[PDB]
Design an enzyme around this catalytic site. Structure first.
Site, mmCIF file in Angstrom:
data_model
loop_
_atom_site.group_PDB
_atom_site.id
_atom_site.type_symbol
_atom_site.label_atom_id
_atom_site.label_comp_id
_atom_site.label_asym_id
_atom_site.label_seq_id
_atom_site.Cartn_x
_atom_site.Cartn_y
_atom_site.Cartn_z
ATOM 1 N N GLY A 1 1.258 -1.464 0.195
ATOM 2 C CA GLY A 1 -0.144 -0.452 0.101
ATOM 3 C C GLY A 1 0.866 1.427 -0.241
ATOM 4 N N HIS A 2 0.430 1.951 -0.515
ATOM 5 C CA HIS A 2 0.851 3.851 -0.216
ATOM 6 C C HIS A 2 -0.374 4.670 -0.555
ATOM 7 C CE1 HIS A 2 -0.352 3.495 -3.942
ATOM 8 N NE2 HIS A 2 -0.687 4.709 -4.764
ATOM 9 N N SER B 1 -0.777 9.108 1.947
ATOM 10 C CA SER B 1 -0.023 9.666 2.651
ATOM 11 C C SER B 1 1.107 9.818 3.742
ATOM 12 C CB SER B 1 -0.801 10.863 2.955
ATOM 13 O OG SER B 1 -1.659 10.297 3.688
ATOM 14 N N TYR B 2 0.627 8.663 4.898
ATOM 15 C CA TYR B 2 1.243 8.022 5.486
ATOM 16 C C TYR B 2 3.023 7.454 4.905
ATOM 17 C CZ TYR B 2 0.166 3.766 3.294
ATOM 18 O OH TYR B 2 -0.634 3.046 2.338
ATOM 19 N N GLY B 3 3.146 6.915 3.757
ATOM 20 C CA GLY B 3 4.193 6.679 3.524
ATOM 21 C C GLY B 3 3.978 5.549 2.593
ATOM 22 N N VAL C 1 4.276 1.088 2.404
ATOM 23 C CA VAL C 1 3.716 -0.345 3.120
ATOM 24 C C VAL C 1 4.418 -1.626 1.685
ATOM 25 C CG1 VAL C 1 3.069 -2.038 4.624
ATOM 26 C CG2 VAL C 1 2.331 0.177 4.371
ATOM 27 N N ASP D 1 -9.053 3.134 16.021
ATOM 28 C CA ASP D 1 -9.293 3.098 14.754
ATOM 29 C C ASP D 1 -10.233 1.532 14.185
ATOM 30 O OD1 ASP D 1 -9.510 4.539 12.127
ATOM 31 O OD2 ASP D 1 -6.900 3.709 11.398
HETATM 32 C C1 LIG Z 1 3.707 -3.128 7.781
HETATM 33 C C2 LIG Z 1 2.778 -2.184 9.838
HETATM 34 C C3 LIG Z 1 2.899 -1.699 10.772
HETATM 35 C C4 LIG Z 1 1.972 -1.623 11.832
HETATM 36 C C5 LIG Z 1 1.150 -2.234 11.443
HETATM 37 O O1 LIG Z 1 -0.270 -2.004 12.561
HETATM 38 C C6 LIG Z 1 0.710 -2.438 10.062
HETATM 39 C C7 LIG Z 1 1.450 -3.047 9.506
HETATM 40 N N1 LIG Z 1 0.656 -3.228 8.223
HETATM 41 C C8 LIG Z 1 0.852 -4.860 8.326
HETATM 42 N N2 LIG Z 1 2.072 -5.768 8.991
HETATM 43 C C9 LIG Z 1 0.501 -5.413 6.806
HETATM 44 C C10 LIG Z 1 0.784 -7.170 6.318
HETATM 45 N N3 LIG Z 1 -0.110 -7.517 4.884
HETATM 46 O O2 LIG Z 1 1.445 -7.979 6.878
HETATM 47 C C11 LIG Z 1 0.000 -4.324 5.922
HETATM 48 N N4 LIG Z 1 -0.820 -4.248 4.792
HETATM 49 C C12 LIG Z 1 -1.164 -2.869 4.865
HETATM 50 C C13 LIG Z 1 -1.729 -2.618 3.261
HETATM 51 C C14 LIG Z 1 -1.965 -1.724 3.378
HETATM 52 C C15 LIG Z 1 -1.594 0.192 4.079
HETATM 53 C C16 LIG Z 1 -1.336 -0.949 5.295
HETATM 54 C C17 LIG Z 1 -0.277 -1.293 5.822
HETATM 55 N N5 LIG Z 1 -0.213 -2.114 7.053
HETATM 56 C C18 LIG Z 1 0.553 -3.634 7.527
#
Ligand SMILES: Cc1ccc(O)cc1-n1c(N)c(C(N)=O)c2nc3ccccc3nc21
Length: 272
Positions: free
Chosen positions: A34-35, A37-39, A41, A150
């Site tokens: 994913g991508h 405004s937060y950044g 992933v 959230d």
């Molecule tokens: C990296 C991270 C850090 C802290 C947290 O609480 C969760 C995640 N995270 C994960 N652990 C993810 C995963 N598929 O394993 C995953 N997928 C995302 C997709 C879209 C937007 C945000 C996402 N964030 C994700």
């Protein structure tokens, strides 16, 4: 010069020299999960140990001390939650060049993604398990005085064999602070008053959204109708008597009268 520093409340394959960053050197970007405004992933394999992890990195460098403290707070909120089967576990976090990196366990698609791919209401058998897993997570957070604030399908991540984990603790607060998604906000949050009850109401709308394949309103009259104590008859028709009765408890407008996560898990319908 610049160098990554660990964030908490060394790795072979990475040499302090070289222009490439620690994330670029000590990890292999397999795909972008994913991508925004937060950044961004990424699903990554680490050159350190070869295992699979997910890594989230902030978009732009820290604007200042408050922006840095706000971003680093997610790591602190992650540590207060501790390890739990229904909570996304954080492996380690670091900062470099004003950019914050969070390394967590790799999970499946988000509950929002999974529902999008199926494009319909989830079978009640799947819903109950997801409702149970997130209630277990919420009970864990609430027992320590933490409010997620959230809870929504985007922040629930599926696990193997039909399990799921609660994630994204960036908005988590400790009782004794940030804007949330209005579609899932508890009614009392408009008038202030923060409490663990808000997560139960948010989880009710998430389940109500995924179990009925209904798009929750951001505002207006429809937003109010979901918070008067009744369910919209059109979408909630297919619900079983048990599921409808659990949702009514979770969507109780009065936070004083609303069931708690520990109470709901003790109901007959919810059995491991
Ligand atoms: C990296 C991270 C850090 C802290 C947290 O609480 C969760 C995640 N995270 C994960 N652990 C993810 C995963 N598929 O394993 C995953 N997928 C995302 C997709 C879209 C937007 C945000 C996402 N964030 C994700």
């Amino acid at each position: 010069q610049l160098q990554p520093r660990r964030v908490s409340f060394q790795s072979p394959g990475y040499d302090p020299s070289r222009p490439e960053s620690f994330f670029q050197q000590s990890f292999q970007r397999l795909s972008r999960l994913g991508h925004g405004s937060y950044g961004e992933v990424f699903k990554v394999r680490s050159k350190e140990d070869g295992r699979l992890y997910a890594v989230k990195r902030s978009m732009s460098p820290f604007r200042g001390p408050k922006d840095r403290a706000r971003k680093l707070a997610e790591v602190g909120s992650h540590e207060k939650v501790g390890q739990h089967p229904c909570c996304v576990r954080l492996e380690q976090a670091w900062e470099e060049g004003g950019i914050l990196y969070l390394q967590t366990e790799l999970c499946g698609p988000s509950l929002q993604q999974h529902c999008e791919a199926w494009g319909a209401s989830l079978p009640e058998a799947q819903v109950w398990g997801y409702l149970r897993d997130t209630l277990l997570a919420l009970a864990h957070l609430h027992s320590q005085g933490l409010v997620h604030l959230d809870v929504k399908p985007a922040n629930i991540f599926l696990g193997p064999r039909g399990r799921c984990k609660l994630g994204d603790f960036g908005l988590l607060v400790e009782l004794g602070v940030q804007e949330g998604d209005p579609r899932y906000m508890a009614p009392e949050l408009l008038q202030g008053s923060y409490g663990t009850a808000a997560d139960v109401f948010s989880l009710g709308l998430t389940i109500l959204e995924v179990a009925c394949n209904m798009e929750l309103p951001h505002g207006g009259e429809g937003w109010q109708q979901l918070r008067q104590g009744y369910l919209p008859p059109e979408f909630t028709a297919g619900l079983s008597s048990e599921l409808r009765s659990v949702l009514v408890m979770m969507l109780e407008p009065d936070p004083k009268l609303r069931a708690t996560a520990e109470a709901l898990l003790a109901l007959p319908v919810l059995r491991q």
